[PDB]
Amino acid sequence: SKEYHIDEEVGFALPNPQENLPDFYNDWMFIAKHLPDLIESGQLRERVEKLNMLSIDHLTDHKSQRLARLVLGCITMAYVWGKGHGDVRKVLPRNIAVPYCQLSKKLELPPILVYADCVLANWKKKDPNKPLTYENMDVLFSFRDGDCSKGFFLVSLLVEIAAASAIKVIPTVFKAMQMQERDTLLKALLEIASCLEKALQVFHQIHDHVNPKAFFSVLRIYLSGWKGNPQLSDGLVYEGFWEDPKEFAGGSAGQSSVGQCFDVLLGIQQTAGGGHAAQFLQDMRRYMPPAHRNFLCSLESNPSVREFVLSKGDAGLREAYDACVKALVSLRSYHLQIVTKYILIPASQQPKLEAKGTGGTDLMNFLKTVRSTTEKSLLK
Ligand code: HEM
Ligand SMILES: N[C@@H](Cc1c[nH]c2ccccc12)C(=O)O
Ligand SMILES: N[C@@H](Cc1c[nH]c2ccccc12)C(=O)O
Ligand SMILES: [C-]#N
């Protein structure tokens, strides 16, 4: 939390991000706040084209810059894909592309919508006095009518917030290890285990608030990017800023720092091996914010928790360590059931070889590999 930008309450998410931008950027905000109206009519592309270029000099604080990144991101997805039928643009106008790339270079992120934009910085609460919950929360931006983006982004965000309770315990783990405190370390790991068990129960909410057929058909194509995607094979041309088409992967909770945090914390070597699964999870750290990228680096630059627990010859300590790994295996085993209900079954129903995700991976091969690596890390 010191320099890593991690909150006790909300976790990796942005605590109370801005809703309104400054008065200078009202032209972007009007396109963002009315994305379903402009895109359904079929008048979005002409409005983005007919819009004079603007500088990014008047964005003082950090919260404004990520709001503008979310705004510019949502328009860029909505411009490229459009109706979600097939008609797409290989080139983005220089009036929006240049300020977005300059803003992207400043925040050290790529010029595309990412998990940090559409989940972590895309929320408010209705009544500030009430706590964090779906009934007292709402998104800032949506793509279409009946896309279930409110239910989607908040249920993703609420599971991120569930893991916040575990992230604050990590300083206790490494303090207990270097000072040789068995009881502190055992209780700290069980707390992390219980917190990750609670995050799975928050996942269950997704069935209530997100419809499968709505999600797959309309929302999923807006979250999709242009890295190894048949529609934009060479990539997306950022006119003015760049020379050629540049490939950039779509949004995914692969870009969440929570997923990769507890694998690194528990010594689950996902990023090792150099396979197609390991190659993806390392690449997605460049799609995370710079502060959370440093946090994962910080956890890797610490003594191994796995090696410590194995050395001690302690049943209770291994058991507490396994509780964390079993919690990750449960979350991943449930996440596959979501993928079956929200991708596989919807994909078979639509009319006219392995399926590609929004991030670009062979999802069924990728997720089962990543879950398998987690399960092998169990002790006895
Ligand atoms: C309708 C809901 C969801 C669907 C359809 C879905 C689908 C997928 C797919 C296809 C991937 C593979 C990467 C890619 O996009 O190419 C993936 C990865 C991932 N998803 Fe989800 N997902 C959903 C919700 C969630 C939620 C709510 C979380 C966490 C709060 C989550 C965490 C992850 C993580 C961490 C990865 C990276 C691989 C891993 O660590 O297991 N997903 N997801
Ligand atoms: N990222 C999830 C926890 C998690 C870790 N690995 C996962 C794999 C799939 C789904 C979720 C997870 C959270 O915020 O609590
Ligand atoms: N990767 C998912 C989409 C997805 C799930 N959670 C996300 C969070 C942010 C951006 C995209 C997503 C898919 O292929 O269907
Ligand atoms: C989940 N992407």
Residue numbers in the entry: 12 to 363, 374 to 401
What does the paper say about this structure?
We next crystallized the F270G-CN-Trp complex in the presence and absence of IDE, and solved their structures at a resolution of 2.69 and 3.03 Å, respectively. Remarkably, in the absence of IDE, electron density associated with Trp is evident in the Si site. It demonstrates that the Si site can indeed accommodate a second Trp, offering molecular explanation for the substrate inhibition behavior of the enzyme. The F270G data show that the Trp bound in the Si site adopts a unique conformation with respect to IDE. Specifically, its indole group flips 180°, such that the ammonium and carboxylate groups point away from the proprionate-6 group of the heme. The carboxylate and ammonium groups are in position to H-bond with E171/S267/G270 and V170, respectively, although their relatively weak density indicates that these potential H-bonding interactions are not strong. The E171 is fully conserved in IDO1 family of enzymes. In addition, it is only one helical turn away from S167 in the B-Helix, which directly interacts with the Trp bound in the Sa site, suggesting that it is a structural element mediating the structural communication between the Si and Sa sites. Although both the IDE complex and the two Trp-bound complex of the F270G mutant exhibit impeded enzyme activity, their structures are surprisingly similar to that of the wild-type complex, except that the heme is more planar and that the protein matrix is more flexible, in particular in the regions near the JK-LoopC, the K-Helix and D-Helix, as exemplified by the ability of the R231 sidechain to adopt two conformations in the IDE complex.
hIDO1 is a heme-containing enzyme that catalyzes the first and rate-limiting step of the kynurenine pathway—the dioxygenation of Trp to N-formyl kynurenine (NFK). It negatively regulates cellular immune response via depleting Trp and promoting the accumulation of kynurenine pathway metabolites. HIDO1 is an α-helical protein, made up by a large C-terminal domain containing the Sa site and a small N-terminal domain sitting on top of it. Here we report the structures of the wild-type hIDO1 in complex with Trp, an inhibitor (epacadostat), and/or an effector (IDE), as well as comparable structures of an active site mutant, F270G.
